[PDB]
Amino acid sequence: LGGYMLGSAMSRPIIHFGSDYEDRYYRENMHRYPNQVYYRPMDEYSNQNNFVHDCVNITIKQHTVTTTTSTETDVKMMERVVEQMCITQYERESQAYY
Amino acid sequence: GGYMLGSAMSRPIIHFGSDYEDRYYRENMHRYPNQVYYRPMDEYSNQNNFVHDCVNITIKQHTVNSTETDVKMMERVVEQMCITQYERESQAYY
């Protein structure tokens, strides 16, 4: 089922979009998204695919909860940056894990 | 010219926050290109212009009915393959 770790903060990924609007939007608003991701701890069943899959799901789900205090563009930006950060987190965990 | 066509690369498995899109990608990823067009590396080359160039040329080249979902998937596949191609070409330029 569940149980997720929260990774340490990281620099927000710079991401380039074909849409001039999205490209500029991300540059001006990347501060609005998290700089940490939730993930399922590295074990014997982990691999990049399933680690990033879970991290992306959990992190986005948790973020929806947390910000109970759209837009479609924001959902799109959020998923791109979370996925990139989740890959970075996989590199962290898999290397620490050896 | 003056763009290059990169060699085929393994299709990335790309993750979406939407359960529908995430699964749609898994089932249909074979429908999108596994090569991108790009401007070869030089002393003026940075991730910024390299990625933007690659995305602009690749998406048009492709632009010559498909669903809004496939258009979305294709644009994202290209945006993420152009990053990979930059990394590939970066190392090559050393």
Side-chain angles (χ1 to χ4, degrees):
Chain A
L1 304 189
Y4 336 107
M5 296 221 59
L6 184 52
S8 302
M10 62 182 75
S11 297
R12 298 149 187 301
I14 283 84
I15 303 165
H16 299 295
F17 294 89
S19 167
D20 291 355
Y21 178 80
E22 294 175 0
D23 195 61
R24 172 159 173 190
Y25 183 95
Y26 182 71
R27 276 196 314 271
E28 296 193 1
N29 299 277
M30 51 175 91
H31 64 280
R32 74 178 307 153
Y33 314 115
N35 60 4
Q36 305 176 268
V37 300
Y38 291 92
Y39 62 96
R40 170 189 187 290
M42 194 86 181
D43 68 18
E44 60 257 61
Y45 310 118
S46 309
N47 60 27
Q48 188 165 336
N49 186 44
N50 67 33
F51 179 106
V52 177
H53 173 78
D54 286 336
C55 178
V56 162
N57 277 322
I58 306 162
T59 300
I60 291 170
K61 169 156 43 164
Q62 208 49 60
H63 184 260
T64 308
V65 179
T66 304
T67 309
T68 183
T69 58
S70 264
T71 67
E72 284 179 41
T73 291
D74 281 318
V75 170
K76 192 179 170 172
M77 295 305 98
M78 258 277 282
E79 55 177 10
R80 204 74 55 101
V81 71
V82 170
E83 180 187 39
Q84 279 209 20
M85 292 189 303
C86 284
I87 294 163
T88 300
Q89 197 65 42
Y90 174 78
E91 290 161 3
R92 292 171 160 184
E93 299 307 315
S94 61
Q95 278 149 231
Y97 189 73
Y98 312 124
Chain B
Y3 292 97
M4 303 211 332
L5 175 54
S7 59
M9 61 175 92
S10 204
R11 290 186 164 82
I13 288 268
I14 298 181
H15 301 279
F16 299 69
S18 141
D19 293 346
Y20 178 78
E21 268 123 293
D22 200 56
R23 175 164 169 191
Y24 186 100
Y25 188 80
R26 295 194 296 271
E27 293 199 10
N28 297 278
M29 51 186 296
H30 50 102
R31 300 157 96 283
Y32 312 116
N34 65 2
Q35 298 174 275
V36 303
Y37 293 85
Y38 62 94
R39 181 198 174 264
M41 287 286 279
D42 63 30
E43 74 273 11
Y44 296 126
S45 279
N46 48 39
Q47 195 180 230
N48 173 246
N49 63 42
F50 182 107
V51 173
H52 280 296
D53 283 335
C54 174
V55 170
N56 290 342
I57 193 54
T58 300
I59 288 177
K60 73 176 67 190
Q61 292 263 23
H62 174 285
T63 229
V64 82
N65 323 102
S66 80
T67 72
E68 298 202 321
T69 293
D70 289 313
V71 171
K72 183 144 336 208
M73 297 290 155
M74 178 274 299
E75 303 199 337
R76 169 126 177 233
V77 162
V78 169
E79 283 163 351
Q80 307 198 197
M81 283 195 300
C82 286
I83 301 171
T84 312
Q85 195 66 41
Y86 169 71
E87 292 170 3
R88 193 141 83 168
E89 287 319 307
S90 274
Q91 306 190 250
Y93 211 68
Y94 290 123

